[PDB]
């Protein structure tokens, strides 16, 4: 009655992770195509992030949204932990960005709309993703954006958080400055992401992380000349140093620049 490793044929690696690989998978009976996320228990327990894996599995499995990747189930075998994820045929936005160097305003606004919708749903359930980045954004069979990797996420209806969570180039100032943080970290990373979609590079990118920490804390960056006034306005609002001064996701979805370039409506 329970999941077993024998239930799946393992295909090519879909991507490498911090504690194991994600493989293309086939349920032997129904021939249903899936993604199998494999995590070694030794690496998880050594780094002491088992509690975070609990959060990833429990939170993602109970979420239901067209723009959020589905986690159908999980199982383990005293050596590895296996996550059964929804298959995203067109790969990452990261690979797409690398392929295209940069997105135009139509594509960028479309991705932001889909992402803001999914995040708005997350925050309504008091969930914070805390790891928004192109590598963690997948594309469906019709090119729809879907959030993935809830490996840094947390259910916080009560507490404000203290965990240094996320990825270097996308880390909010409050985390860097050793402050507490809330759901407003997703809107900072949304601003960092919108910049990278248009420019092709993170706004605080540097050779060292110490310099990156400095630039993030100062919110020290510039736009290339071709970035439109509407795009500059949206990004600047999302990249406020003061977390409470950052807009709401409802305000992002109703942003003039967003509604004039997006190919998809709001929730």
């Amino acid at each position: 009655r329970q999941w077993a490793l024998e239930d799946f044929e393992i295909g090519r690696p879909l991507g490498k992770g911090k504690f194991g690989n994600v493989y293309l998978a086939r349920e032997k009976q129904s021939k249903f195509i899936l993604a199998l996320k494999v995590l070694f228990k030794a690496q998880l327990e050594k780094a002491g992030v088992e509690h975070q894996l609990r959060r990833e599995v429990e939170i993602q499995s109970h979420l239901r949204h067209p723009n959020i990747l589905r986690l159908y189930g999980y199982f383990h075998d005293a050596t590895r932990v296996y996550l059964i994820l929804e298959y995203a045929p067109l790969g990452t936005v990261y690979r797409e960005l690398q392929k295209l160097s940069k997105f135009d305003e139509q594509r960028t606004a479309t991705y932001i709309t889909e992402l803001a919708n999914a995040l708005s749903y997350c925050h309504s359930k008091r969930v914070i993703h805390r790891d928004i980045k192109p590598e963690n954004l997948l594309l469906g069979s019709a090119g729809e954006l879907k959030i993935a990797d809830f490996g840094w996420s947390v259910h916080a209806p009560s507490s404000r958080r203290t965990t240094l969570a996320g990825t270097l180039d996308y880390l909010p100032p409050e985390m860097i400055e050793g402050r507490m943080h809330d759901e407003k970290v997703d809107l900072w990373s949304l601003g960092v992401l919108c910049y990278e979609f248009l420019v092709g590079k993170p706004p605080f990118e540097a050779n060292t992380y110490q310099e990156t920490y400095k630039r993030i804390s100062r919110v020290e960056f510039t736009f290339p000349d071709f970035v439109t006034e509407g795009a500059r306005d949206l990004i600047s609002r999302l990249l406020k140093h003061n977390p409470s001064q950052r807009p709401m996701l409802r305000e992002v979805l109703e942003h003039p620049w967003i509604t004039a370039n997006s190919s998809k409506p709001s929730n």
Partner: protein, 33 residues
């Protein structure tokens, strides 16, 4: 206990096949205060 999560772990028949399951979050907030 370790690796015993509040999540689906049973075999699913993908040949066969709501929005409420979201209520798990509200439930958890109340339970844990």
């Amino acid at each position: 206990s370790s690796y015993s999560y509040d999540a689906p772990s049973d075999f699913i028949n993908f040949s066969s096949l709501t929005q409420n399951i979201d209520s798990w979050f509200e439930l958890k907030a109340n339970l844990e205060n």
